[PDB]
């Protein structure tokens, strides 16, 4: 699946910057385009008009090179003449991608740094802008962010026709689009000048240093590069987004490289004073992150994960670590952002058709796929696991459903089975498996400032990413042969993560880790401003004045919401407070308000919302304080994509 | 296009699983040629157009789904593509007889009142019927639960079909019932004769009745047919949307007819006393609609027309006609709602290219197409228009932009001109040329229950419809040999508008008309009530709740909404009444709150919103008791399709 040319912006050549749009591509010849990734198609213009199957944007060419956006190029390759351009430049962190550009394609030159600006947009629109730091302007005239959706990669010229940089989000007030952020292009001249490799573990710096280890998979990550470490006589601290995990290494460090590390999780904790420690994030940051002195080595094992604990983990890790007197932080895993899913040896990848036994995803899995062996099926959902599971025991095949809130011991370590799990499998378990059944899709949480009457958590199906698909086929082939089966080939981008997941931070931060909403934002901070790590859009400053507002929050919900280990428990305790406060319904009668049943009867009236968490069934109140407050900081700048 | 089976929801206690039997590539190839040599299985089938995905269910012989979703589109099919046989536009029901290999559901007979509808993810939502039309959701869900599951069946324990799933009936977002398509409907839809004459005027019956007028471009339904009927001693109101043609026909009767008939527009009256009268909608609205035994025979021409004036015009008449003594309705048109585009022999029809010296669209125009001659491009907005006037006229080309606002006199009668229009040249100029260059898109207004803190006004820019395409199409080729020149062959279902329209009317009936919402109520129920017309989502009850609390409008501001002659002169006047009288600012200095330019500096704070009209720049205040009203009327039953 390549990037598509479906079309150019042609710009003038002098007077007034204006432009016009040439579409060269029905939708047809782009989804041909895009299998083939052959283009023979002449490129003309320095403004390409590109696409993928799932959404279109821009792209500019600058000093040879035809730069666009990561958060819609993924690391796709260009669709070219020869075949397949695979892009020379990948930087998640910059939000940039480059292409070298092909036969025929002009260069836009760098801008003498004038502030009067213009921005070229899909519609071949040229809007004025004002130049308002390295890589901001605003919108003389404000605009609907509607206007600017699709603009991504759009040139911002500068009077002369010289770029300034290429348009990558609006900055939004309640809607409106009053600034742009762009990519600038001293950010490209860095990007084409910068000298590397990251498979190797890291020396130990003179000072600290933060470090990167991206290690193949079965090259001792977690145990081989610790035990390293702790040979040359460094103390070491190895934490790990799973108990499981964790206590695995603990179990095999004790066994076979003679150590007897000490252990931190929930379940089990255990002090040797050995030079090593296995922790999990979560309980790191319960006994209050880095303390005097104790390590030397920081190594942040599956860096990828974009669950809230290990963002705030790391994040509380490169605050302190240097302060604490580490010498090293490793930031380590098998997939950092940008990488793609590429063949393994020991992996049979296999394409699930129509024919099979066992409906699966509009696709089938036949019954002699999983009658003889050990097999993991993915599914996105508790329902279809269920469902799953129960069919396939009648069929006479030992299937066992796994997800959260369920004991591991349901699977067993012997004979033949067939687990129906959700990704939950991966940080509750730790076994392989003869063959992988992948849905290739997940469960996500997507934010929307929907000012309906704040914002919107929304639950979403979506295409799984290259870290999910490569973790998820990971779980076979381990040292001996296995079979990766999917419904769907090809990945969404890796190492991108929604502002959902920030606002989880500081609901963490509050519920399980006695973090001030300022504090959580120190830490958030310090894994933003780190490269190489998942990226976000900077809602720091919107999340920390959300979670200011939420104060004497009723201590009883929130042990509730915490126990029940549903999603948000502060902003569900929290939730439930303002409506037993005010004697008012919940916003509906789901299992997310079960702390409130025992009041049912004397609750009556609109419920006072405070955001949407789902579904909004009784009438509302606006009227609240707190809603109001909520209200009021829907007013910061929110940067958002378009 | 075609419409095109990517897939099937197979049935069993009723239980569903579905399976995916195309992809993107096959979907647009299969769309393209109309060949689907894939075997069909099952009863549920899932089906694409270009744009949207939707259910078929097969009842007797016959695969169903809705019109909104299928529009006129025939189905990929064996041999070639099937055209439709049924279509039923007041009902949302299309049918093909059912591709060989393809098993239909019986209909239910016995009513069961426990019904189970089946979803595009092959769910089985558990339904109570209360009506006909109505089933009650067993536990309400959000909307997009729903979405893409138009066409699917409502079953009953048997497995047998009650209807086919059509609309959400929503309260505040919330699908809490179901509408349906029930098979009694089809059973009428078949029992129907396939083709009706309604080429010819009918005869006047001895009782009131309502026909149809479906008549060709030059067959003179506006002069010949109200003359045949005079001749007849009959007393003939014809009323048409357009000022240019009501006057251009009185001036036509006096020539080839020898009635001098009474002429009725806001601009100019005569009262020659004559049987026949011209009128206008607004100007037959202005007058206070139907009087008592002054007209036999009511023509609505140019009865397809979905602008405000004309839908009010024609319900007024249907309410008030057999009542003022009248015989006869003739609801006249060319393009009828389910109408296609179909070949004009007087018309060549050529595609625009990308080789062309003339930037339109993301084709281009040659030179040579335009240079001598007179030629009308239409745009979809005036700023358009004058980048494209401003163009031709440095090429040499005498080329002339005409829209709202500018005056008829701009167009010259005689000599080469290229006429750069909107879809307002169609009521202010009657003329034709020698090609149409047609961009294929028009603005509209939609309708968004937004909850932020009511409801949103939305413009943007759509494909055209069949209606739209052939009135563009058919200013060339009148009486001689046109051209016709296009950017994309596409063309939306005819005969549907959006519940913005029905707002509209509301307004129009305050602004304009003298009329309570209750009054405009009667009239559009009668317009909305009447098979055959135009379709819209029924929203009476609820926009006639919102405008009934608008009382007290300042009579100063709404003088200044109309003289100003922009879209919702009453909603716009009623904000700036509550901005005025709580002394606060209009939502944004945008042209539309120029009524509050005198009362600036004394207006400051937040704007008390009562909905969005456009973009809101300043703070919002949700503490007015009207804001507080139109958010009560918000938790009305809104049905939605999805
Ligand atoms: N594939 C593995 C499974 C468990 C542990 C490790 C490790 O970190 O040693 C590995 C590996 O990546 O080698
Ligand atoms: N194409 C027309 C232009 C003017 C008048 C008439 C008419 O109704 O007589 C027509 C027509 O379509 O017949």
Same mark, same amino acid.
């Given at each position: ?142 605009? *609907? @962010?509607? &206007? ?11 009077? +002369? %026709?010289? $770029?300034?940089? /290429? ?107 050995? *030079? @090593?420690? &296995? ?11 880095? +303390? %005097?002195? $104790?390590?030397? /080595? ?345």
């Amino acid at each position: 699946g390549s990037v598509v040319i479906v079309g150019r912006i042609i710009l003038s050549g002098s007077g007034s910057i204006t432009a016009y749009s040439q579409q060269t591509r029905g939708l047809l010849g782009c989804i041909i385009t895009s299998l083939t990734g052959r283009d023979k198609n002449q490129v003309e213009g320095e403004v390409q008009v590109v696409s993928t199957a799932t959404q279109s944007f821009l792209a500019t060419c600058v000093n040879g090179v035809c730069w666009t956006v990561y958060h819609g190029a993924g690391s796709k390759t260009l669709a070219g003449p020869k075949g397949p351009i695979t892009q020379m430049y990948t930087n998640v962190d910059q939000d940039l991608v480059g292409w070298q550009a092909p036969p025929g394609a002009r260069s836009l030159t760098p801008c003498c740094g004038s502030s009067d600006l213009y921005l070229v947009t899909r519609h071949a629109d040229v809007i004025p802008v004002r130049r308002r730091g390295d890589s901001r302007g605003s919108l003389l005239s404000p605009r *609907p @962010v509607s &206007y600017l959706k699709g603009s991504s990669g759009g040139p911002l010229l500068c009077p +002369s %026709g010289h $770029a300034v940089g /290429i348009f990558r989000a609006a900055v939004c007030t309640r809607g409106v689009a009053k600034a742009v952020d762009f990519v600038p292009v001293e950010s490209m001249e860095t990007t084409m000048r910068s000298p590397t490799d990251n498979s190797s573990p890291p020396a130990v710096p003179q000072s600290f240093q933060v470090a990167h280890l991206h290690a193949p998979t079965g090259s001792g990550k977690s145990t081989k590069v610790p035990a390293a470490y702790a040979a040359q006589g460094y103390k070491v601290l190895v934490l790990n987004p799973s108990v499981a995990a964790t206590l695995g290494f603990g179990a095999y460090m004790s066994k076979a490289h003679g150590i007897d590390p000490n252990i931190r999780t929930g379940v089990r904790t255990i002090t040797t004073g050995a *030079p @090593v420690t &296995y922790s999990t994030y979560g309980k790191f940051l319960a006994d209050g992150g880095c +303390s %005097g002195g $104790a390590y030397d /080595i920081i190594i942040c094992d599956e860096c990828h994960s974009t669950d809230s604990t290990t963002i705030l983990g790391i994040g509380t890790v490169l605050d302190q670590a240097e302060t604490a007197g580490a010498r090293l932080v490793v930031l380590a895993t098998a997939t950092p952002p940008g990488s793609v899913t590429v063949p393994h040896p020991n992996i049979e990848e296999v394409a699930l058709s129509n024919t099979g036994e066992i409906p699966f995803y509009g696709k089938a899995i036949p019954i002699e796929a999983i009658r003889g062996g050990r097999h993991l099926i993915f599914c996105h959902s508790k329902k279809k696991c269920d469902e799953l599971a129960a069919k396939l025991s009648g069929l006479g095949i030992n299937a066992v459903a796994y997800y959260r809130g369920l004991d591991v011991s349901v699977i067993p370590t012997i004979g033949d089975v067939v687990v129906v799990a959700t990704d939950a499998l991966m940080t509750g378990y730790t076994g392989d498996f003869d063959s992988v059944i992948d849905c290739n899709t997940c469960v996500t949480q997507t934010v929307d400032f929907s000012l309906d009457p704040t914002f919107t958590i929304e639950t979403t199906t979506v295409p799984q990413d290259a870290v999910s698909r490569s973790q998820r086929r990971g779980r076979t082939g381990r040292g001996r042969r296995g079979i990766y089966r999917f419904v769907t080939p090809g990945e969404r981008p890796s190492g991108m993560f929604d502002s959902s997941v920030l606002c989880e931070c500081y609901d963490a931060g509050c519920a399980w880790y006695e973090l001030t909403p300022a504090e959580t934002s120190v830490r958030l901070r310090a894994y933003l401003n780190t490269p190489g790590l998942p990226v976000c859009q900077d809602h720091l400053e919107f999340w920390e004045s959300v979670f200011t507002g939420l104060t004497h929050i009723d201590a009883h919900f929130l042990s509730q919401t915490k126990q029940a280990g549903d999603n948000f428990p502060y902003l569900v305790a929290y939730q439930a407070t303002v409506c037993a406060r005010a004697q008012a319904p919940p916003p509906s009668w789901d299992q997310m308000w079960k702390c409130l049943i025992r009041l049912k009867p004397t609750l009556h009236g609109p419920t006072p919302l405070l955001y949407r968490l789902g579904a909004v069934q009784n009438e509302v109140t606006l009227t609240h304080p707190i809603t109001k407050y909520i209200m009021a900081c829907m007013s910061a700048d929110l940067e958002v994509v378009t």
